[PDB]
């Protein structure tokens, strides 16, 4: 009986050391011990370079550690948000480590002797969406708690209106990108295949040597013709200037990590063609690499002579007169849409220019309409039926409108979100082939050009099995018609649907409305419902998964920060994530300067609810349920009561909400009348906790407003970190 | 990117030789390359006897080659109607190629060394049904070009009148046949098994020493009584005397050419009972075998001297006065039904009866109303069915009636068609086992006597998949509802309908009507609505696909030669025969002596239409499908037009019938509008043939009418024949 409670980054991290103790009170009235593990960007560096640390400096692989744990049928991981690093924070982390003495190797950006280059191939394992795919061997169930939309309903959030001439659009590809010329198949048997590329010279390039493929796998073979992307962006730049419309680009190059800069980079390239032209040749022997954003450009420049570095950037800001308007993140520091790959990512940025009426931010401050460069039409067309429906019908009225939940085909690195190590940019014209070892069968032709980017994503058989079991059972225990997000004219998701129809007939779905559309389609369903009222599960591939994931939830609740995000893991176990967002740095920068946490542990109560009544089920174990369900009951109260953590410097913060949860999670266990032991056992703490509430509360928000000491960043003291985030002793003591 | 057209023999090979460069002037248009391959029975003699020819002579084994062709998804191979050699054609080959040089063994029919016994065996590899047996990797798809039948129903075909007091029946057995007492199973686990027949003596004959059998499998122990079979016959003769209805016997003993000429031949000996007991001892020693009809008996007492010759034949004729009359294959000569056993084939002789309103010739030249003796019941009461209803309901009317395609199982020698080797007449009373050689397991028992024939066929788990999808696919792409005709009654027909009981849920079958029904039954729900102008798809095993899909086309459209019979290999590539037919020797005689090729070249053009229709399908090809279109008007322009080959010498031709297809070919592909560099590709070539229509056209005919030069028959000169083929100056000069 153990849940596994995960240390990570920044604020998340914060929380946990004031949260840790409370919830370990609570676990153990049931006999269940909170074990600890730490992945933490530090941790991890730790964990990988124990080459020279002392035995007690040395850390576990706790990421393969928990990794390992996935298979075990009676894992309950609880996953708080965590960094997926950049270099700039991986070197901070490193800087940190070095000066606190652990001894770690630098990160060498371009190594010079070859040694250098194995220890970056080893930081390359610690860099970005490192976490997420070991984690994740289950399917994703991703809704908003009944509790939570109820809350949003009484308190609506502000949505800018949608014009009926508004002008902004998604703009795709219609040809030369990778759905329009995908190819697909379902294995027969297993086999051991290779990436080869076949010259027009005659020589036999190996980009992939071997990978492992079982029976019932489903393979693509997609590429993007760089010629046609780059006469896309020549054709959607020019029309958003002749139409006066605002130019923004949307993609995910965070964790699309080897196609989507190359798609950004092109940008850049076409966008200001007339200035990589006259410094082509400085460019190059600079290494300037674009597909970085232009913040690549600025600091290989930065260090050149003034009048140097001046007239490159004149050349830059002279070629916005033949150009479109382009969108800004920071509009007063001149910070574009093109400034960093990282800064607009497509999940988040598309509903936020939804939310906003279809709106992103000019460069004279000014919100208006855009339009948002979506290249990749395999997934991006859905946006543009909403944005078409908004335009009919007006924005969205979240006192009113249903919900869309989603069952997620993620399992094992699903699809696109485990072609990484499968992606290739082209070196040069000819045909690519995915070829069996044991027999020289090619089983998927495509022909290439040089620069076009050509992957090979991978969804095995008994992800999709337990992705159309979860869908049924969603639809049964909630009574929520479900809808599969196929497309007809897309090979993958032809070959889905012979699964997915076939894995129906499986199960028992006699009382249910069970249907597979194609997503324009299925997303004009969708939205016909949930603007009267009614819900829709929307059971999708892995992408898509995560769109809609934030897009809904975001328009129905003004955050995806506030649901369930539970990871039914098919060896018997549950992963539950307490947040889709990120570690919020600028929540750590308020801690540590004025002593206030505004991070929102909303999304860590959810979790531990969903924790502690699977492990009602799984194990049998009653106590459990009980305290499931008044924490259920306790988390209602947190909203009903208003008792979220504030925003402002000096009033109630992430500290003082985790009291009030607390305080009502002991009440909720003291007035209920299902387990007589419990009942009397938090009775006097209960009327401990409530007794004093304006001496703790008058403690937690006294202690507010000055610079604060936790002892570091990256890996924050544990003893001066326990001092900031657990401050009133009236409270410490009551357990 | 290729397209194999086969070269086979007689009058098709001329046709080809006249139509491979105006195919390849189009094919190449799309970047198609079109290969041949020879697989004439000269071609298929000389592959297999490389022992004595030089290293020039040697031809590569193009059948061989072509059966693994079948196993790329790629495969594309239109083949053309060849020779199933028999004896004498076989014979003839062997002269023609030893006469130009080829040294190739004579065929021994009576091998007198150890040394001629083996080239016997080594040619009976290229004699009767050879191509069909290793091309045929996938299931039938036999149907009526919508084009065709809309011009059956404007030109009717001449189709004789039902009397209701029709005689003419179809008499079969009912007990003592492979029906009345089969045995059937499916295997569930692989297996090897052997034939053997455990004797009265205590002794077990070997008579099939292994055969391999996968799991999934159906295999069948089938017998026919020689005592029941004689007793059937000596009634039925009977029958037909007491009657006075003309005897005729309907048998398939070029395909089935085992257990069909031992059928036939049992008919002869009671039908002349009184003949071959007077002369017994002679005819035995003289080694007559009537098994091969009268004829062979004919060619055996020729040589005797004249007195005792025309005893012989007196007997034979004096036999005829208490017997009823024979239909006749020839009045004039005297050739009967009797003469030979591949003169009458079952699967044409039946639709040519009925079509004819019941009726076959006789001694005098005239119709007859006949009593059609089938003697094996399984396939045979079909046409019975049939012959009832246009009993009551009269001649059906093509200008109203409907279509009945079919969907046949045949892959891999699936059923009967693949029993041939494992075929057996018994040699002495005893029980006749299938048993497993690892175990002592008896699978399936039977009990026979000296004389009957007894067999096992199988059929692949793998090839019913195939034809189940297959089914379903037609009834989704056309709208017309499909019969699978099973039988309840027939243990193989009850194990099929097992696994497409099974199979049918494998699939998407929503909107589709789909039923199984006993064969009696099934085609008289077909025929109750095709005589209402309704359609209905026959889904049915080997044989009935066979005799079904001359029956109905015979009816429809007046011949069964005008007709696509697409095969989807399994492997993902596909076979067009461009007809089921023969090569049509006659036409050849015609050719050669007065210059003017009557064959019709349709089914060939409508083959072709199919292999670029499947061609854009499944590599991607724009222009492919752009052909295939423009191919489809242009076939149903020259039918429109009138312009097919007439059949008497100084009129419109083969040669001419082509040229007007090529127009409008080109110009289907001249006023198109989807592709505009086709549009203006072939507009030079269009304006030329449309100008030069009386000049092309006034050569191809003042050539006719004189002997002409083709070096040869079996394998005639390619530079002779060419000059044959082609003799318009102007045509040609235009490519
Ligand atoms: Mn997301
Ligand atoms: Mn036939």
Chains 1, 2 share one sequence.
Not at 597 to 625: I, Q, V, Y
Request: glycine share 6%; hydrophobic share 35%; charged share 30%.
């Amino acid at each position: 009986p153990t849940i596994i409670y995960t240390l990570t980054d920044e604020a998340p991290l914060l929380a946990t050391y004031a949260f840790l103790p409370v919830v370990r009170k609570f676990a153990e009235a049931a006999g269940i011990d909170v074990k600890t593990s730490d992945i933490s960007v530090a941790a991890r560096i730790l964990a990988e370079f124990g080459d020279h640390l002392t035995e007690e400096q040395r850390v576990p692989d706790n990421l393969g550690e928990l990794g390992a744990l996935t298979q075990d049928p009676s894992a309950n991981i609880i996953k708080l948000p965590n960094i997926s690093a950049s270099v700039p924070q991986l070197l901070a982390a490193i800087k940190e480590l070095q000066g606190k003495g652990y001894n770690v190797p630098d990160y060498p950006a371009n190594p010079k002797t070859d040694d250098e280059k194995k220890i970056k191939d080893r930081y390359a394992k610690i860099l970005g969406s490192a976490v997420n795919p070991v984690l994740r061997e289950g399917n994703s169930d991703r809704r908003a708690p009944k509790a939570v939309k109820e809350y949003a309903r009484k308190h609506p959030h502000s949505m800018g209106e949608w014009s009926q001439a508004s002008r902004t659009h998604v703009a795709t590809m219609k040809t030369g990108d990778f759905y329009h010329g995908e190819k697909s198949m379902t294995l027969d048997r297993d086999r051991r295949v290779k990436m080869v590329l076949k010259t027009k010279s005659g020589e036999e390039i190996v980009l992939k040597p071997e990978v492992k493929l079982d029976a019932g796998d489903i393979i693509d073979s997609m590429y993007m013709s760089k010629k046609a992307l780059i006469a896309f962006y020549e054709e959607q730049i020019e029309d958003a200037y002749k139409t006066g419309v605002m130019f923004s680009l949307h993609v995910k190059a965070t964790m699309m990590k080897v196609s989507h800069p190359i798609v950004f980079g092109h940008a850049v390239k076409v966008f200001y063609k007339d200035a990589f032209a006259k410094h082509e040749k400085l460019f190059d022997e600079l290494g300037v690499n674009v597909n970085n954003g232009l913040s690549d450009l600025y600091d290989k420049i930065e260090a050149l002579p003034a009048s140097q570095r001046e007239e490159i950037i004149e050349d830059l800001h002279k070629c916005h007169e033949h150009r479109p308007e382009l969108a800004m993140v920071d509009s007063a520091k001149g910070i574009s849409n093109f400034h960093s790959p990282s800064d607009v990512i497509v999940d988040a940025s598309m509903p936020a220019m939804i939310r906003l009426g279809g709106k992103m931010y000019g460069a004279d401050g000014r919100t208006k309409d855009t339009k948002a460069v979506n290249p990749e039409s395999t997934f991006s067309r859905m946006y543009q039926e909403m944005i078409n429906f908004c335009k009919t019908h007006g924005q969205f009225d979240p006192t009113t409108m249903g919900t869309v939940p989603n069952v997620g085909l993620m399992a094992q690195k699903a699809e696109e979100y485990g072609s990484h190590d499968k992606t290739f940019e082209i070196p040069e014209d000819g045909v690519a082939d995915i070829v069996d070892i044991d027999t020289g069968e090619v089983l998927l032709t495509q022909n290439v050009e040089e620069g076009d980017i050509w992957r090979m994503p991978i969804v095995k058989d008994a992800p999709i099995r337990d992705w159309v079991k979860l869908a049924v059972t969603r639809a049964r225990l909630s009574g929520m018609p479900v809808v599969f997000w196929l497309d007809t004219e897309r090979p993958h998701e032809v070959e889905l649907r012979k699964k997915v129809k076939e894995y129906l007939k499986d199960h028992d779905t006699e009382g249910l409305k069970i249907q597979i559309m194609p997503q324009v389609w299925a997303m004009r369903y969708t939205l016909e419902r949930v603007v009267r009222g009614k819900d829709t599960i929307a059971a999708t591939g892995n992408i898509l998964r995560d769109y809609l994931t934030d897009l809904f939830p975001i328009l129905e609740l003004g955050t995806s920060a506030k649901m369930l995000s539970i990871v039914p893991l098919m060896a018997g176990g549950g992963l539950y994530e307490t947040g889709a967002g990120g570690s919020a740095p600028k929540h750590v920068h308020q801690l540590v300067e004025e002593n206030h946490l505004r991070w929102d542990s909303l999304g860590e109560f959810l979790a531990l609810g969903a924790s502690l009544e699977d492990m009602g089920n799984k194990t049998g174990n009653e106590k459990a349920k009980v305290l499931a369900k008044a924490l259920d009951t306790a988390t209602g109260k947190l909203l009903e009561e208003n008792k979220s953590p504030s925003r402002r410097t000096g009033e109630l913060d992430n500290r003082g909400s985790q009291f009030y949860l607390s305080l009502f999670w002991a009440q909720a266990l003291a007035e209920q009348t299902e387990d007589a032991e419990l009942a009397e056992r938090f009775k006097p703490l209960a009327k401990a906790l409530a007794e004093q509430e304006e001496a703790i509360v008058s403690e937690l928000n006294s202690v507010q407003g000055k610079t604060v000491d936790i002892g570091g960043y990256y890996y924050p003291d544990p003893e001066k970190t326990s001092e900031v985030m657990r401050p009133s002793k009236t409270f410490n003591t009551t357990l």
